[PDB]
Amino acid sequence: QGIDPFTMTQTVHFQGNPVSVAGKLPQIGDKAKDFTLVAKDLSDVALSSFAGKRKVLNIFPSIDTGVCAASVRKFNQLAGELENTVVLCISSDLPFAQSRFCGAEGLSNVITLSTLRGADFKQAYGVAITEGPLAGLTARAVVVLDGQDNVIYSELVNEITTEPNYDAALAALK
Amino acid sequence: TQTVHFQGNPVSVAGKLPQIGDKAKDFTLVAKDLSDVALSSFAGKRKVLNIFPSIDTGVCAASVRKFNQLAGELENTVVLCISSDLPFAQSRFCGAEGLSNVITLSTLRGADFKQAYGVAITEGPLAGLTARAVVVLDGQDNVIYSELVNEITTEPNYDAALAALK
């Protein structure tokens, strides 16, 4: 067989509890699957609309907050300031609730995208939370794509309130 | 499919809004604390299903709030403000916040509710949201009032919905 039976199914932690996440996060070398998500004006935005640019897919359970860690904002700012790069902050919050994201608002080349339309992205990117109070939301993950949509960095955070490795994601773009 | 409008723009709505005399289908939606809330948990109480495309707003009409407050104040009556907004964004609703017997419910889970109640917007910019409607249920989940507004921007007939509860 050409598959790994010993790689355990994706599990993340929330409130000290193991939570299942459907699918498999794309790994370095994989070709990222095309997706369509919803922007702040309710228009549909396809991954193909960013052809040639490097993409930082910064995936969150929710970005609907009035207070955030400086590191969240700093990573989005730094990545968005790099040449030929777009940061896509993705969550299940509706576009009406994403505009007040403490870590994305007013940042150059940082776009918020909603899972409102459609959930095929969640399965394709292995970020769908399927158990507990968070079921229906996306897990916390970072996926960096080069100019040709090849994965150059991938991280599914073990604990949902834990920050991903921002230095490693940025290093992949250098 | 039913046809409604958003500021005059045609909007397609899937399913059939329950009419007076129908037995409303059970549902399980998501409360403010991320707990699951079933329609069956309100057995014996009358229910106002106040369905909105979004309740995520910092400014709303006094009529929206007065209706929820008045219906929620009536004995053996609960108001369920339903939308596709996540529970994190449903607490800001002026029309529901701090009102007795008025609770917000999200389609984060149990989304088949949308088709079952004929409020599912399936195509266009509003696809994935609910249309604007009010469905009033008695103690035994029998519909006593229902209204799917033809123009999403206009309010349902609150005086009629309240009259059905009298």
Residue numbers in the entry:
A (entry chain A): -6 to 167
B (entry chain B): 2 to 167
Could you share sentences copied from the article?
Tpx constitutes part of the bacterial defence system against reactive oxygen species (ROS) and, correspondingly, is upregulated when E. coli is exposed to oxidative stress. Atypical 2-Cys peroxiredoxins are functionally monomeric, in contrast to the typical peroxiredoxins, i.e. the resolving (Cr) and the peroxidasic (Cp) cysteines (C61 and C95, respectively in the case of Tpx) are situated on the same subunit. Tpx contains three cysteine residues, two of which (C61and C95) form the redox active disulphide bond. ypTpx has a regular thioredoxin-like fold: a seven-stranded β-sheet, with β2 and β6 running anti-parallel to the rest, although with an inserted N-terminal β-hairpin (βN1-βN2) absent from other peroxierdoxins.
Crystal form 3 captured ypTpx in the oxidised state with an intact intramolecular disulphide bond between Cys61 and Cys95. The crystal belonged to space group P212121 and diffracted to 1.74 Å. The overall oxidised structure, diffracting to a resolution of 1.74 Å and presenting space group P212121, is similar to that of the reduced structure, except for some differences that are mostly confined to the region around the active site (see below). The redox active site of Tpx is made up by CP and CR (C61 and C95 in ypTpx, respectively). There is a conformational change between the two states, involving the partial unfolding of helices α1 and α2, and a shift of 8.4 Å for C61 and 5.1 Å for C95, respectively, as presented in Figure 4. The two structures superpose well, in particular the core parts, with an r.m.s.d of 0.7 Å over 135 Cα. The binding pocket is mostly hydrophobic with one hydrogen bond proposed between the ME0052 p-hydroxyl to the ypTpx I153 carbonyl, which fits with the chemical shift change for the neighbouring T154 amide. The chemical shift data indicated significant shifts in the amides of residues from both subunits, highlighting the importance of the dimer interface for the generation of the binding pocket and compound binding, as illustrated in Figure S2A.
